[PDB]
Design a protein around this nucleic acid. Structure first.
Length: 310
DNA sequence: GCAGTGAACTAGCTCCGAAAACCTATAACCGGTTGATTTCGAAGCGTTTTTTGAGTTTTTCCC
């Protein structure tokens, strides 16, 4: 249930959170034996209330006493609906509320306005993304066994070439387009491996074939996971690195990018070819995300870029 | 003047479709002959027509 070992983030489902006798208690079908009792309550913990759960104001009081962030997310924890805002660590605020302020916003803003540094960040994002493609498509054979048998030499050549291109070109405007070309080739490779036939990527949900729908669902979950990552870091969604400065919710899409083609896309084609239900697809996606430590990776990346930007 | 959307735009690509560019045979055209018949023309001024130009009014087309 520990959703991110890097963030001390826990997912609670099928239980009520209430305060009896001055201690926050979980009313669950397992009673005393539920693992929720092992939840450490400290300023380092952060909760994610899941499906079928409710919380009492008294609990909110006790958690605030202990300084524990709370957030509501849907099935499996991908769509993050609402959460507590996290503080910002600077010398002029200084409340004693015992809430672990986080300093990453200052680091982010310290460079966000300098375009050259912003570009350097974009490059760093894409380096990470490609290396996660090469990892999941080649190094690990779980997909191979599942049925996603694809050629390697063509994929390796394409990825090598795109990586070679990343280290070049002057502005965001090229990077976006280079990624788009890589995207197209990856789609073609996946369709060939899946024997799905010809594939064309419609957008704004105009597609009707299973592949398109499953891609949309997968991307929706990925966005939710990224939103969780940013919220844990406290960075507002508007300070995008690679998407346009006017794009509402740009940053989450920047962060979501580092898994779409690594983990969502193959599963979308696999499930479409296998003829799965939408529910089966959702469960498979969440299982893949859990297996890959996705949230932890996207946390590590954001921290790495912050430290590297100095 | 603002918040908002939709249109113009980005790189390089394979991949695909089309007009462009090139090769071939050969039928029509090129050159040579005779020579009595008809056709054409040397200057140039006046007449008549074209056809170019000149403007535009109207009509038609496309959106």
């Amino acid at each position: 249930i520990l959703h991110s070992k890097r963030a001390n983030l826990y997912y609670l489902q099928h239980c009520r959170v209430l305060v009896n006798g001055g201690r926050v208690e979980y009313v669950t079908d397992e009673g005393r034996h539920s693992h929720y009792w092992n939840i450490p309550i400290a300023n380092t913990t952060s909760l994610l209330l899941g499906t079928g759960t409710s919380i009492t104001q008294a609990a909110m009081r006790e958690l605030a006493r202990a300084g524990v962030l709370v957030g509501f997310c849907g099935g499996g924890g991908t769509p993050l609906f609402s959460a507590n805002e996290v503080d910002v660590e600077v010398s002029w605020l200084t409340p004693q509320s015992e809430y672990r302020p986080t300093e990453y916003l200052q680091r982010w803003v310290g460079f966000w306005f300098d375009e050259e540094k912003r570009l350097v960040a974009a490059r760093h994002f894409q380096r990470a993304r490609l290396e996660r493609i090469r990892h999941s498509w080649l190094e690990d054979r779980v997909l191979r066994d599942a049925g996603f048998a694809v050629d390697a030499t063509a994929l390796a050549v394409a990825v090598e070439d795109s990586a070679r291109a990343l280290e070049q070109a002057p502005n965001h405007e090229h990077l976006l387009t280079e990624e788009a070309r890589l995207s197209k080739r990856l789609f073609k490779l996946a369709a060939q491996a899946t024997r799905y036939g010809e594939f064309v990527r419609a957008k704004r949900g105009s597609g009707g074939d299973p592949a398109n729908r499953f891609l949309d669902h997968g991307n929706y979950l990925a966005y939710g996971l990224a939103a969780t990552a940013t919220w844990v870091l406290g960075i507002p969604h508007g300070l995008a690195v690679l998407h346009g400065k006017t794009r509402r919710g740009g940053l989450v899409f920047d962060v979501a990018d580092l898994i779409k083609d690594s983990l969502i896309l193959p599963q979308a084609f696999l499930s479409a070819m296998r003829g799965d239900e939408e529910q089966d697809f959702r469960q498979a996606c969440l299982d893949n995300l859990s297996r890959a430590q996705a949230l932890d990776f996207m946390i590590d990346t954001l921290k790495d870029v912050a430290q590297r930007s100095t």
